[PDB]
Design a protein around this ligand. Structure first.
Ligand SMILES: CC(C)(Sc1ccc(CCN(CCCCC2CCCCC2)C(=O)NC2CCCCC2)cc1)C(=O)O
Lengths: 262, 10
């Protein structure tokens, strides 16, 4: 049954992501440590990422230290997304090379969708729910580092106005991953059929869970397209950083994901 | 054996 597909996907999302929207809102309502300036950045580093500045790289610029912490977080999130993908019914029956391709193109769209759950108009919850970085602090970083997060806050504020819950977001992330128009897929037809099943369950679930919003499904299709564009632009900025910033070397896994992408 | 594929095989 399609209700079973939706529940299995939701259960896989609750199991595999450390942060979910209910948990994040519980914390964001009221005690995470607030990073809003350089003084509090340095304090947070000593409490929450002690090893990073035990010596250490703390003679590198603050923007570069933040970027490193962000890379570590993305490496962790790719692992969580991979375990979630492996639990999406039918994903494990795909060609292993197609599974790689789907993850490669889908992870950052899924990341920026899920980032919305930890953002409000003032900032974002970070470090496994233990810190909160203000949106204004991130805007205050030197270029180009101040240009990374702001488009993601802009996406998140509109996405959050749709008032989705984790049961919806889990299906939306599954739809993002199981996308038959990624470049290089071997078995496009089998992936399109899998995608169709997930999208069908998403359409029915939104009708049930959001009876008040008759356009919520096409709104979410548009958000998927917006996320693809957001990822293309993000990758372009990452390339500017990798090229102009010597201390901003990419973790090998992230280099692999970005290579030959867009 | 890419790192992504390694994660899938974990
Ligand atoms: C790293 C690039 C090269 S650029 C990039 C990409 C993503 C992000 C958002 C990272 N982040 C803040 C992580 C902030 C860590 C904090 C910094 C200050 C000191 C204490 C620790 C965060 O919380 N991510 C969530 C995780 C939960 C699931 C949703 C995503 C920032 C930059 C990449 O493309 O990967």
């Amino acid at each position: 049954d399609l209700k079973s597909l939706a529940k299995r996907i939701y259960e896989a999302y609750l199991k595999n992501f450390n942060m979910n929207k209910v948990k994040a809102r519980v914390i964001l309502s009221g005690p995470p440590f607030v990073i809003h300036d350089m003084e509090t950045l340095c304090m947070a580093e000593k409490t929450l990422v002690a090893k990073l500045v035990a010596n250490g790289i703390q003679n590198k610029e603050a923007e570069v230290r933040i970027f490193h912490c962000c890379q570590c977080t993305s490496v962790e999130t790719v692992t969580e997304l991979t375990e979630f993908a492996k639990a999406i019914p039918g994903f494990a029956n795909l060609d292993l090379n197609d599974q790689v391709t789907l993850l490669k193109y889908g992870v950052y769209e899924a990341i920026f969708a899920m980032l919305s759950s930890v953002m409000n108009k003032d900032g974002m919850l970070v470090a496994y729910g233990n810190g909160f970085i203000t949106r204004e602090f991130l805007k205050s970083l030197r270029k180009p580092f101040c240009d990374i997060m702001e488009p993601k806050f802009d996406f998140a504020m509109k996405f959050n106005a749709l008032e989705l819950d984790d049961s919806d977001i889990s299906l939306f992330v599954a739809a993002i991953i199981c996308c038959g128009d990624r470049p290089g897929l071997l078995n496009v037809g089998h992936i399109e059929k899998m995608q169709e099943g997930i999208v069908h369950v998403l359409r029915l679930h939104l009708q049930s869970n959001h009876p008040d919003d008759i356009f919520l499904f096409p709104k979410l299709l548009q958000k998927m397209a917006d996320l693809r564009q957001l990822v293309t632009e993000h990758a372009q900025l990452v390339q500017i950083i990798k090229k102009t910033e010597s201390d901003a070397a990419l973790h090998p896994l992230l280099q692999e994901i970005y290579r030959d992408m867009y | 054996p890419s790192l992504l594929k390694k994660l899938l095989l974990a």
